[PDB]
Design a protein around this ligand. Sequence first.
Ligand SMILES: [Mg+2]
Ligand SMILES: [Mg+2]
Ligand SMILES: [Mg+2]
Ligand SMILES: [Mg+2]
Ligand SMILES: [Mg+2]
Ligand SMILES: [Mg+2]
Ligand SMILES: [Mg+2]
Ligand SMILES: [Mg+2]
Ligand SMILES: [Mg+2]
Ligand SMILES: [Mg+2]
Ligand SMILES: [Mg+2]
Ligand SMILES: [Mg+2]
Ligand SMILES: [Mg+2]
Ligand SMILES: [Mg+2]
Ligand SMILES: [Mg+2]
Ligand SMILES: [Mg+2]
Ligand SMILES: [Mg+2]
Ligand SMILES: [Mg+2]
Ligand SMILES: [Mg+2]
Ligand SMILES: [Mg+2]
Ligand SMILES: [Mg+2]
Ligand SMILES: [Mg+2]
Ligand SMILES: [Mg+2]
Ligand SMILES: [Mg+2]
Ligand SMILES: [Mg+2]
Ligand SMILES: [Mg+2]
Ligand SMILES: [Mg+2]
Lengths: 213, 155, 121, 50, 122, 81
Amino acid sequence: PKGVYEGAGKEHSCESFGVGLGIARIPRYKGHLWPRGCFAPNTRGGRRAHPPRPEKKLHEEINWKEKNLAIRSAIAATAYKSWVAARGHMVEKVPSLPLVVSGDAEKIAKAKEAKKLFEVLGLWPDVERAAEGVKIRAGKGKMRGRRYKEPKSVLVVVSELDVPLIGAVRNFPGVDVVPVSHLNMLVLAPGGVPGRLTLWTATAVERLKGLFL
Amino acid sequence: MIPKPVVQVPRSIKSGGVTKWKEGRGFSLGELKEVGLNAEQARLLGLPVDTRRDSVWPQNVEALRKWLIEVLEGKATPPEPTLPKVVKVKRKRGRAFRGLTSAGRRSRGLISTRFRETHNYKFKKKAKERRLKKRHEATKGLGNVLRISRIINES
Amino acid sequence: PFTASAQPRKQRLSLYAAPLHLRRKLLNAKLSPELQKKLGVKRLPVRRGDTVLIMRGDFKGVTGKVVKVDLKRVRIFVEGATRTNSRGQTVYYPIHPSKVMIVDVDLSDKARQKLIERRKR
Amino acid sequence: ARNKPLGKKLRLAAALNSNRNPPLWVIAKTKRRVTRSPARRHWRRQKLKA
Amino acid sequence: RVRLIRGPFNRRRPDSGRRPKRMGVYGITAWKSWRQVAEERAARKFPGLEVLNSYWVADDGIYRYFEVILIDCNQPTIQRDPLYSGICGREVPRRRLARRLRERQRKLIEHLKKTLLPKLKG
Amino acid sequence: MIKRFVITEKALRLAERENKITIIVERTATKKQIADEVQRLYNVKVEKVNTLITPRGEKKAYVKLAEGYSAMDLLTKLGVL
RNA sequence: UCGUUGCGGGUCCGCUUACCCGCCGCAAGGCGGGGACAGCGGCAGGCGGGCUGUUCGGCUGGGGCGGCACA
RNA sequence: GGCAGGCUUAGAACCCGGGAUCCCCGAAUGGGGCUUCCUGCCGGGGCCGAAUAGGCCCCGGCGCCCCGUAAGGGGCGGGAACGCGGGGAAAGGAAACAUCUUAGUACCCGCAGGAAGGGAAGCCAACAGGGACCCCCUGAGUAGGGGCGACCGAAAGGGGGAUAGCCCAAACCAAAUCCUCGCGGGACAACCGUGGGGAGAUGUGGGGCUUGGGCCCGGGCAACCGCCGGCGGGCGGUAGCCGAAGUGGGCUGGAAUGCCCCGCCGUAGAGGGUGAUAGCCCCGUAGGCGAAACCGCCCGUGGCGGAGUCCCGGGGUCCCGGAGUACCUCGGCUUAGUUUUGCCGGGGGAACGCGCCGGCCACUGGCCGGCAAGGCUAAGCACGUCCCGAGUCCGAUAGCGCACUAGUA
Ligand SMILES: [Mg+2]
Ligand SMILES: [Mg+2]
Ligand SMILES: [Mg+2]
Ligand SMILES: [Mg+2]
Ligand SMILES: [Mg+2]
Ligand SMILES: [Mg+2]
Ligand SMILES: [Mg+2]
Ligand SMILES: [Mg+2]
Ligand SMILES: [Mg+2]
Ligand SMILES: [Mg+2]
Ligand SMILES: [Mg+2]
Ligand SMILES: [Mg+2]
Ligand SMILES: [Mg+2]
Ligand SMILES: [Mg+2]
Ligand SMILES: [Mg+2]
Ligand SMILES: [Mg+2]
Ligand SMILES: [Mg+2]
Ligand SMILES: [Mg+2]
Ligand SMILES: [Mg+2]
Ligand SMILES: [Mg+2]
Ligand SMILES: [Mg+2]
Ligand SMILES: [Mg+2]
Ligand SMILES: [Mg+2]
Ligand SMILES: [Mg+2]
Ligand SMILES: [Mg+2]
Ligand SMILES: [Mg+2]
Ligand SMILES: [Mg+2]
């Protein structure tokens, strides 16, 4: 939630001085600054007419059943090269989609070894697209800690939390990794667009059969 | 897993005979007596004890017997006793000035009726709702807007 | 102790408002490969009397002794990285320590040797 | 006034001590950023409420 | 012993604009009883003492008489009294009660092993 | 209690012509305390003390030494001249 | 009118100790007068622009007076 | 960001902990105070002086109301908001306006804490059962109040956060009691021994707390209840330390972090700085380590006191169980409380466990539920001067009035 200070521009000692003085009847400073305008939104230092309010509803709620239908729809899109390529991923070197790797991959602990795994599955070019695609974004976001805009590359889906592969891949540019039970629309359709280049482990695909349904 | 007492929800006239169960405040003295305990011993074992309750439910007795056997055989660890573990009484200053003596308690209504029904409680409760715009205080005149709208839309 | 916050405003406020004992950490410069095998450490705060090689800027490639360190400005003056003003005097270019490499270490100070043993470990 | 109480006189002394501009070396030290003092006043214009 | 004038409190007639409901004087009383007023006046005469309770003693045509009980919470005799400690404060370290309770629980389980476990399983 | 000496044109003239030293002391010092301090510190005899409070809030004492002690000699000995 | 309001005698008389008024006294208490009245609190009726809040309609060959062309 | 002169390797600056100094006014407290300054008495000290006189100066004590035998001790003033008690509007709304609302609000007076208040059934229910309290979600804008208009507005119940239960008085015993000081002992304590003083029969103390108790008899230790916070151990806070990998070739350029080519780390590609845009230059980050001193939390262990106060069974039918209170009436404020909410004031005014109170008008009978008028109580909930983090917030006429020698001139 965002907002202005509740008393902003409203705490000066001001009053309208009426008609007959040859000046507009907006409120003005009472003291030594007298004629200076005050309070009204059209005056310098005046209140903001319709500012943001912290009580504003920002969350767009969704039914649970509807959210889970969308998750299933987004999952299915990861199996189509047309949807994945249209989202912007590099899919030329990927042997097939959905990309399923053996559950042994979940034991890889070092970023160096996970890099080798990505290269031999044809996923490294998309990681390189994200590494080269990081830019300094235009506008005031730089001042607020949003200086860098980074493309998304690969979503790695593992069987469970705390497997070594989570730490081995999470440092790559644009890579997200989740256990299968943590799948969500933020990783499955960045930009609100279906088709994310996804690497499933075989054990993750098995666990998927009892989730989001 | 220390059992939780199961008690019956009071059956109102409004219900028309439909009944349900709920978690109780504590095990009754009758239930504890069937497993050979008093209120003190049961509290020392970490059990919630309700000496006010008169009913004895066999499902509560059965849960107590099962768990006691686990405890007395070293298979279950009782939690900490359900007795006070700290004593924290602060020095009081200006009891008379804040209406905390018996005379103040009487004038505040606390001798004749419940705290929730005293007038100062009503004043504070409604002030909070209006400050936060909670529940029915988000709309002033809500009842009359509903009443007139129902007439027009149900005519 | 330098903020943990990711907000640029708090990162910069930490840097500009840092007390003197924290500003010393900004004086760290990489040791030359030769010194790294002799001492076993990768970085040391630059000190007056050290000899540094300048790696960036107009005086890139110039090696000289550090003559003065300014904790407030986090700048160092190096022999050779100089110029003359209009009145003919010799003045020093203030060089940021992250742009130099230490090639000779001044170890006459016993207190400095403690820092080395800590980092060698 | 001719007949002053000391307490008032010492408040007048404080105002006399503070009524002056920053020294010239302060202007140099701050690269002309500090040139005025808020305590600077003229006896005829800005009145003390002493 | 506190003596005070009985009757309703000194309700003031408002001296500016009011709607008619807010203009009355006679019969309007305070939500405080005279007993609470007596306790408060006593407390002013004995600064630092705590009012424990009070009771009515007598009435006459103009006055009402109360007696107020006050205690000095700084006195060693007062501090350890089981009733007065509720006013003067009381602290028992958690390490004392918890240790005592843990010991009692441990000894009870051993006793119940002998005298109760067979009956439960029988 | 003595803060400094006054070595202005007026003060030096009073030293030579009237055997007086001029000092700045703490504002709460009295004529009795000023005379005691000067005698103890400098081993002279004080004839009388005249005091005033300057418009800048400082107490100034014109201290007249007795007729066996030289104000000019004392200032020279102290090295304040 | 209820309470303050008590004590003797046959609604009446008396009494003083309540209470009230004044004098003296630092206070303690004394003196004199009144006296279960008065005064004071609650309740009730009357007088009550002393003070508080308000209302002083509409149509209308401008408003007002009239009229009611206001049902 | 100046001119000088110094300090610092005998370890400074700086940061953290602990100390020292700390003018006058200020609760301000010897007394004043129309000038943040003046002035008194007593005791001690110094000086001027022939003086021991007299005068001047310095230092300390000297507030009001209280507790306590005294020694001694307490209250006072402040704090951004939050909390408790009391006093208490109008504007506006009702398309006028008075009941009403606004609102028990604004504001005023008093009083607390790190939270406050509440809290342990004279309860709720309906013959089925819940089981202290507060706070959150709901019941619900329902019942109900109301020029039955505007509008106002519960509670029980259900789901959660959290969980905890006790004491004073009295019955019975009758000084077995508490406090203070000296001396000896006792982890610097509690406490023990002894002596003096104070409190105490108008009752200290024991006992007792709905699973009522007192009283009588028997049996049993897993008795029960309380005081001290020493010693050992651990963890945390208040400074910090360690932490991977290019400053590689060429180009442009004042200067590269940019472009081309070639490498490397990654549990670290959060973010910042650096002569233009940096994972690998530096700070940092993932991750790990750390305290002479001060503070906090937890655990183990130690010291001691009581009148058996603890558990179980039997007997009881005797004793105790809270007053201007319950209740009636009149006026008034308030409440959804309505012939029925709470309270204040005036007048009247109980009973006692074989009794008393409640079950939406009163009374009667039945049934059901309880024991007012004494006290305490952790946790779970409010707030933001302050500290930390975050951000579809603003970007110097914006955003706090103040990005700056702003609550300043
Ligand atoms: Mg503004
Ligand atoms: Mg929207
Ligand atoms: Mg732009
Ligand atoms: Mg409402
Ligand atoms: Mg003038
Ligand atoms: Mg009005
Ligand atoms: Mg003079
Ligand atoms: Mg009369
Ligand atoms: Mg009358
Ligand atoms: Mg009028
Ligand atoms: Mg009319
Ligand atoms: Mg008209
Ligand atoms: Mg007419
Ligand atoms: Mg004073
Ligand atoms: Mg206070
Ligand atoms: Mg308004
Ligand atoms: Mg109106
Ligand atoms: Mg009007
Ligand atoms: Mg609390
Ligand atoms: Mg409390
Ligand atoms: Mg209301
Ligand atoms: Mg007793
Ligand atoms: Mg480091
Ligand atoms: Mg590094
Ligand atoms: Mg009772
Ligand atoms: Mg501005
Ligand atoms: Mg601009």
